[PDB]
Every structure is written in structure tokens, then in C-alpha cells.
Amino acid sequence: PSWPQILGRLTDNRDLARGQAAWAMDQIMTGNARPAQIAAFAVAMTMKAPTADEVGELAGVMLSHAHPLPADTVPDDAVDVVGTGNTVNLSTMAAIVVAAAGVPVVKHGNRASGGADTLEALGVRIDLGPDLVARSLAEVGIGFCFAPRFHPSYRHAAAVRREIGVPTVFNLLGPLTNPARPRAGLIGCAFADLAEVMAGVFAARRSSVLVVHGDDGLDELTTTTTSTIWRVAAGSVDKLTFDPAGFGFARAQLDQLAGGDAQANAAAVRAVLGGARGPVRDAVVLNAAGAIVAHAGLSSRAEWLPAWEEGLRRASAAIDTGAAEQLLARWVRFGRQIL
């Protein structure tokens, strides 16, 4: 195995042999890959079109280098709510709403607005060690794994990612390398082909996940139009077309849903959790419900439609009853009380 061999195979538009993606990622994680080699691999893998097996090797090697949460501190029904990339506004709000509905949530991200930035603008302490993320989950029902603290060996790839800027297969790794390893979640992707790849990876993990792609390009469930959902459970995938109009959701415009910077997002979080109505609320409710449906897929034998009706009810209620606003405040309170 070597870079000329692996890079050559990719530029020739061939899928890699089993273990080659893993070899490449291990070189990258151990500081043995030159920045040029990392970049070449990232780009070549992207333009070749990665397979689920390849991405599975990349994520798997990365996790083998990550710091875990302490034993028996992550509830086995914890969920993730995130997109691959911007809808940080939607995913941040959805995550808070899901937690306020009684579902444990553990997120994973970094400062870019990134997921971490919006949370910091709300007064949340994002940079916590494993022991305290665990406490946060137990005491608040939500936690955040700061990527630099849990994936320190990813620093070389991270530097290259910043330098080239363009999205690559590495953008898919965030959701697939949550160090808390939640077994469920709502995972958005901006590209349909890659969404399907991600669903394949989650399937092999026996997770209960909704991998979602707005047919308008959104890396969340959209209200602008239909969405494609890759419904993942019991080692298999159920691909379907999803229309929120069937749940009474008005059609919105794309410019209404797009996130902004950390402060603009924070302002939007405060307004929505305060009860402000509009397209942004609807999108948050929609994706929160999606996460709740995924959560139900773990234990409940509840069917698709009734699961959604209950998920939408619980999401809306988490906002309307002030539970979400109250949970965020409790989350901020927790970080301040650590000192």
C-alpha cells in the first residue's frame, strides 16, 4: 500500500480495494501523511465518488483514534441532530427541542458559523472533557463533544480541510465519528448521492437513523419542497420521498431557512424558543420530529406515520410549553456552575 497506488486508483475512477481507505486514513491520523497527500486523497476520493465501504473505513479508523466518553455514561438511546453542510441554526435549535422532549442528545462539532459557535453565542460552554460531557448528559439531557478535544489526531486533516476550503468526503465524517457513538439521529446531507452512502454506513452499525436530503439541496428536511429520506434500521435502508405538506406544513422559500453567523443564529434561537412563529420554527419542528422518529426506531415498534404524528406533537409541545427555552437556560446554567 502506498499513496501513488491509492491515488492512482482513485484518479483512474476506480473503487479502492478493501483496507486501502483504512490505510490512507491511518497514515493521516498518525501524522505520517504529507499535507499534499491528504489533499490529493480528499479530492480524488470526492471526485471518484466514495462508496459506503470506503467511508466506513475512514470513519472507523478515525474513531479508533478518538477519545471515548466514560463507560456507561451515554444512554443507549442518545440521538444526534446535525447536517454535513449552512443549517447550523436549524440543527442547533432542533437538538435543543429534541432534548426538551425527553430524548437524550449528544452533538459533535467545532468552531468554524459552526455548530459550536452558535452554542457559545448562547452562553453554552462547548469545550468540556469526557467526564463533564457525561455529567451534562445526565443532568441536562444534552451534551456537546468538542471535536478538537476528542479527535486530537485529526488536526492534520483539519488543517488541510481549511487550506483547500472546498467540501470533500471528509465533510461526511462529522456525523459518522460522534465520539459518544449515539445509535440514533437525524443526519442531513446536501448531496443525495452522498446521503445514500452515509445511510449505508449507518446501516452496518445497526443504528436507527433518518438520513435526510431536501430535494432543494438542503442538508435537513426542508419545507420548501419534498425531501428524500434514507430510513435506516435493523441493518437495512428504506428510501422514500417525504412531503411535509401531508402534515399541514406550508411551503416556504429557501432564503427564509438559511442560517447566518453565530450571533444571527443565537438571535434566531432565542426568538424561536420564545415562541416566534414562521418558516424557521416549522423547519426546526420538522427536523426535531425526525430525530424523535429515529429515536423511536430503537425500541418502539411504532409505525412510520403514527411515529411522525407523535414526533411533531412532542416537538411543538417542547417549544410551546417553554420546555426548550427552559432546557437551554439549564444548559447555560450547568456550564457556569462547573467553576
Ligand X SMILES: COc1ccc(C(=O)CC(=O)C(F)(F)F)cc1
Residue 221 among known ligand-binding residues: no
| Closer residue to a second copy (CB): 194 or 273 | 194
Q: Do residues 55 and 198 lie in contact, with contact meaning Cβ atoms separated by under 8 Å?
A: yes
* Chain Cα centroid distance, residue 7: 28
Compute the least distance from the CB of residue 181 to ligand X, in Å: 13
Instruction: Give CA–CA dist 24/33, Å, rounded.
Output: 8
Binding to ligand X in span 256-275, by CB under 6 A = none
Residue from 48, 107, 108, 295 touching ligand X (CB under 6 A): that is 108
Q: Which residues are bridge partners to 159 per DSSP? A: none
Binding to a second copy in span 148-167, by CB under 8 A = 159-160, 163-167
Residue from 39, 61, 95, 327 touching a second copy (CB under 8 A): that is 39
Using rule CB under 6 A, residue 1 touches ligand X: no
| Closer residue to ligand X (CB): 86 or 226 | 86
Q: Which positions from 163 to 192 touch a second copy by CB under 8 A, shown as an x/- string?
A: xxxxxx------------------------
Per the structure block, which three cell numbers stand in for 168? 470533500
Long-range contacts of 309-315 (CB under 8 A, 24+ apart): 309/247, 312/247, 312/285, 312/286, 314/101, 314/102, 314/289, 315/97, 315/98, 315/101, 315/284, 315/285, 315/286, 315/288, 315/289
Using rule CB under 6 A, residue 152 touches ligand X: yes
Using rule CB under 8 A, residue 256 touches a second copy: no
Binding to ligand X in span 78-107, by CB under 6 A = none
Residue 290 among known ligand-binding residues: no
Instruction: Give CA–CA dist 303/301, Å, rounded.
Output: 6
Instruction: Give CA–CA dist 81/104, Å, rounded.
Output: 11
Cβ neighbours of residue 35 under 8 Å, at least 6 residues apart?
156, 159, 160, 163
Residue 178 among known ligand-binding residues: no
Compute the least distance from the CB of residue 255 to a second copy, in Å: 21
What is the b/e burial string over 277-298, where b = at least 16 CB atoms within 10 angstroms of the residue's CB?
A: eebbbbbbbbbbbbbbbbbbbe
Using CB under 8 A as the binding criterion, the count of chain residues that bind a second copy stands at: 29
Compute the least distance from the CB of residue 23 to a second copy, in Å: 15
Compute the least distance from the CB of residue 306 to a second copy, in Å: 41
Residue 11 among known ligand-binding residues: no
Compute the least distance from the CB of residue 11 to a second copy, in Å: 6
Work out the end-to-end distance of the chain between its first and last CA atoms, rounded to an integer number of angstroms. Answer: 49
* Chain Cα centroid distance, residue 54: 19
Using rule CB under 8 A, residue 197 touches a second copy: no
Instruction: Give CA–CA dist 2/20, Å, rounded.
Output: 9
Instruction: Give CA–CA dist 214/219, Å, rounded.
Output: 6
Instruction: Give CA–CA dist 180/232, Å, rounded.
Output: 19
Instruction: Give CA–CA dist 218/227, Å, rounded.
Output: 9
Using rule CB under 8 A, residue 7 touches a second copy: yes
Using rule CB under 8 A, residue 119 touches a second copy: no
Q: Which residues are annotated as a binding site for anthranilate?
A: 83, 110, 161
Site for ligand X, rule CB under 6 A:
108-110, 147-148, 151-152, 154-155, 158, 173-174, 177
Site for a second copy, rule CB under 8 A:
2-4, 7-8, 10-11, 13, 34-40, 42-44, 46-48, 159-160, 163-168
Q: Which residues are annotated as a binding site for 5-phospho-alpha-D-ribose 1-diphosphate?
A: 83, 87, 89-92, 107-112, 115
Q: Which residues are annotated as a binding site?
A: 83, 87, 89-92, 107-112, 115, 161, 219-220
